[PDB]
Design a protein around this ligand. Structure first.
Ligand SMILES: Nc1ncnc2c1ncn2[C@@H]1O[C@H](COP(=O)(O)OP(=O)(O)OP(=O)(O)O)[C@@H](O)[C@H]1O
Ligand SMILES: Nc1ncnc2c1ncn2[C@@H]1O[C@H](COP(=O)(O)OP(=O)(O)OP(=O)(O)O)[C@@H](O)[C@H]1O
Ligand SMILES: [K+]
Ligand SMILES: [K+]
Ligand SMILES: [Mg+2]
Ligand SMILES: [Mg+2]
Lengths: 527, 527, 87
């Protein structure tokens, strides 16, 4: 329908390269320990300050549609790298710009750009194989702290707090990052089973000092259906009162006659009872209640399958907790008296459920249930003075957490762009099938120097000299751009995750070598 | 009612030829093994990269309405070629531009363009007859792989995977192309009968390792109506329990009392039962249910015609399967104990149903039923790093699948535009009825060199010399433009489907020879 | 002094850069080499410069440096620039 403008060949390619160059120039200033920040206007309020490459890439759109096509393709590079690995987006952007510029430079009448792309992807497969051979698995928490410190722009405190979180909840444990209200970062470890439902009525408070209900050696009654009748709540209270033990009722809702009975027995005779809503909305609520049942050693009442009723309750059908704390907004169960075999079996069931889900939202719920059953969760509260500083720091905390998870998953290599620099001999030994594939291999071979040159250039030194000295040095030696010195990289802890490096290279090479096959570009006439 | 501009004769035809020329120049850069790509701006997101001629043609609209008329007509050429053949759209575009330019050149005061068009169509009929005599039926899977490789721009792996899929599900089997999540392509073969309905309740899971229900030597109950009452489901469970065999209930829905009975017998005593929803929406649902009954040897209950009831079930009315696998999202029946003659009768019925309907949407459902009954289906998952690369590759996979199906239907001829080049002597022998028909014949004779010239020109060599040397060579010789050599074309596997070549020529000639009859063009004044 | 020390590399860098190679690498390798060795940019090789006849007049080198340094170091003393309004 819409009227189109069409341009051909070198003019089109030059305009697309101008778009790619503008986005990559904005992104490349952020690279490395002497990278600087980018300020992005926000329409609704305070601007955003960021060192994150994908965030800078996604914020830049250009009026010229030919330039905007190249800008959008490098946005695709940065976004794909962020989605796969969570770090390395700046590296991916500069690699993509290098591949695009070199590929556009090599297009002549006799050139075959599709075969050049075939050469590029063959070279990238060889580099990825060399990177996997270079890689070393993470063994020590010190390497975890080093990976997190490097990914957090040298903040040793962020690396320390991420390493402490991974010591406490496991290297595969649930670690979330949120706003902190203080100046400094803090780590909170949530042990046991804590959920976001408080008491139903405020009359269950027995400890006024924190406005909470605290019980020790308590029975636990779990109900998948609501409790609103007298007959469905009397025999459980009779068991609790006969055994002289406190009762915690976790249900969908306690309301009406049963709630009034609970409050009346609490106030008048002093019955040790508390009522909490069941967390979750849907099947997750039933799953969480069953997890609580297995942890505490009790049974779920009012279920669909088995149809156990609250009128027939025996003392063995009630869970047992060593400790329970119920505040206004959350409940917490500690040292439930369940069977260890039952808990391990439920954990393995959750693991097999994780192996067959690809929703990326139910996996989070499954992981959180696993963590409540096994090891607890960790919460990193990011401190700061203002919202703009907190958001800037949270970007780096999230980058470091992603990088540390990737390092746990697939190992580490030398940082500073040295990993890609040591893969150049693996390209020197390739035998190209034809001239176009040779051109593509040479494009990748030149591109492998770009991250180290960019890191050095941000540090105000001449990058080509730095890279030449690195390549002339022994394989353990690279350039500390923060210190300005040539150092053993592993011993100084300047390391990168293997996954991040290979992801950034693959995602850059694919898009940019596809971009360099273009002869015609079609755009809409601006209205 | 709108005000119109009216142009006459040579100026009008020159403007329309400018439109035709712009669209064809954009499309022609993609032709052959050294063709390049076209980038098309998309309004909602990332631009599209394509080597597909019809995709480039449809994306180009011009502001000048006289030029846009010619562009729209060559769009009609490319779209018609895509609709009947699924490949050869670029060839059709360059042929149509050639016929339009030659026809416009030949219009003088004494010329009769309608009779010139008659000559053009007579020449095209003679060329199509010569192509049909040139053609050779496909006999070997190696030729299948060669056709698919050529149509996929020389990708031997795409040709290999399409040839493997056609070996496994048949040359006329159902083969679908979808996005893959990996870097590489993968062929999945779905055997048996698999449909997109999982278990009704998660309580039927017996194998925790994949979260699925797995039974061997199972009874199968088919219900065309819903099962919600107790007495509808009791005697089937009585038969299953007496015979000590698992039961699979495929129905529209199992809910309420019957579902609670199934779950209660599953959990408490350990009854081997699973319930699955019946796939399809409407007549397709009852057709799939009847196909399942015939494959398994059971009977459909709750039907309209025969009115069989679920209260009186006999063991002979229950299908028997050797294996059933029920996951969360799909169910699969393997080794149904039906009658071979009944299954073949149902297959013949589906074939005769295919032979009498032309809706192009329920034909897909009929083919799917056919393949579930006979050979299974094939799924090609296209790998890649980004969405733009996957879409570009999927275009070529689809082109190769269409070309391979066309070669199966109507045979093969020499590629490289040589098939049309060897039809020129069949035009030399024609006796034109008058001068105008002679002019039309000569227009087609000149047009027949255009595909080979364009393929050679994209490869950076001089196309006229290449075509002259081809025409001077023996009939098995043509130009390998990828290798840049003169080769036996069939031996090197540079072959084209006969249907694609004839479709492209016919679709180009009709529209372009109609266009060359024009003396007046009427357009709307732009507002 | 540091301005002049950086400037002294510019002719060799510019000659190498016109030859399509990376000038800083060439200049670094020249400085690392023995004093008779320089870069034949026409041949692309590191050679004894006098034996290959790649030589310059001393007067030309000193004249170019002195003339450039005088004017440019005077230019860098400027704080205000006064121009005519174009008519
Ligand atoms: N002291 C250092 N010396 C040398 N290189 C370093 C040093 N500290 C970090 N680096 C390197 O800097 C790179 C990280 O740069 P940066 O975090 O700015 O970009 P990125 O990871 O590509 O992208 P982004 O963080 O924007 O998603 C890594 O290659 C890392 O090894
Ligand atoms: N190595 C080769 N040498 C010569 N001709 C070749 C070679 N490989 C393919 N061809 C020819 O190139 C043509 C296919 O070109 P292409 O697939 O780009 O366009 P198309 O089929 O006309 O249209 P589209 O694919 O856009 O629908 C066929 O005639 C094929 O025989
Ligand atoms: K950065
Ligand atoms: K094409
Ligand atoms: Mg980073
Ligand atoms: Mg094609």
């Amino acid at each position: 329908g819409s009227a189109k403008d069409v341009k051909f060949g070198a003019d089109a390619r030059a305009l697309m390269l101008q778009g790619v160059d503008l986005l990559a120039d904005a992104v490349a200033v952020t690279m490395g320990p002497k990278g600087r920040t980018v300020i992005i206007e926000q329409s609704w309020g305070s601007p955003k300050v960021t060192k994150d490459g994908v965030t800078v890439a996604k914020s830049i759109d250009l009026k010229d549609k030919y330039k905007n096509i190249g800008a959008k393709l490098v946005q695709d590079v940065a976004n794909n790298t962020n989605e796969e690995a969570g770090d390395g987006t700046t590296t991916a952007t500069v690699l993509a710009r290098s591949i695009a510029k070199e590929g556009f430079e090599k297009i002549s009448k006799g050139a075959n750009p599709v075969e050049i792309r075939r050469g590029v992807m063959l070279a990238v497969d060889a580099v990825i194989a060399e990177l996997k051979k270079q890689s070393k698995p993470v063994t020590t928490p010190e390497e975890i702290a080093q990976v997190a410190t490097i990914s957090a722009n040298g903040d040793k405190e962020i690396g320390n707090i991420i390493s402490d979180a991974m010591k406490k909840v496991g290297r595969k444990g649930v670690i979330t990052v949120k706003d902190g209200k203080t100046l400094n970062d803090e780590l909170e470890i949530i042990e046991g089973m804590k959920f976001d439902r408080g008491y139903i009525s405020p009359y269950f408070i027995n400890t006024s000092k924190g406005q909470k209900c605290e019980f020790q050696d308590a029975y636990v009654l779990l109900s998948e259906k609501k409790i609103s009748s007298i007959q469905s709540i009397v025999p459980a209270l009779e068991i609790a009162n006969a055994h002289r033990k406190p009762l915690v009722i976790i249900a969908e809702d306690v309301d009406g006659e049963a709630l009034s009975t609970l409050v009346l027995n609490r106030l008048k005779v002093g019955l040790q009872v508390v009522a909490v809503k069941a967390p979750g909305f849907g099947d997750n609520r039933k799953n969480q209640l069953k997890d609580m049942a297995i942890a505490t050693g009790g049974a779920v009442f009012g279920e669909e399958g088995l149809t156990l009723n609250l009128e027939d309750v025996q003392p063995h059908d009630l869970g047992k907790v060593g400790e329970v704390i119920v505040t206004k907004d959350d409940a917490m169960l500690l040292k439930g008296k369940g069977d260890k075999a039952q808990i391990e079996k439920r954990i393995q069931e959750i693991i097999e459920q994780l192996d067959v889900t690809t929703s990326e939202y139910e996996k989070e719920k499954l992981n959180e249930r696993l963590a409540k059953l096994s090891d607890g969760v960790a919460v990193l509260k990011v401190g700061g003075t203002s919202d703009v500083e907190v958001n800037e720091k949270k970007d780096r905390v999230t980058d470091a957490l992603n990088a540390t998870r990737a390092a746990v998953e697939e190992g580490i290599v030398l940082g500073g762009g040295c990993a890609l620099l040591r893969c150049i001999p693996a390209l020197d030994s390739l035998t190209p099938a034809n001239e176009d594939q040779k051109i593509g291999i040479e494009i990748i071979k030149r591109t492998l120097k770009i991250p180290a040159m960019t890191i050095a250039k941000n540090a105000g030194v001449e990058g080509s000299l730095i890279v030449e000295k690195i390549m002339q040095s022994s394989s353990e030696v690279g350039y500390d751009a923060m210190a300005g010195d040539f150092v053993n990289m592993v011993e100084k802890g300047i390391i990168d995750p293997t996954k991040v490096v290979r992801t950034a290279l693959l995602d850059a090479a694919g898009v940019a070598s596809l971009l360099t096959t273009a002869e015609v570009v079609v755009t809409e006439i601006p209205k």
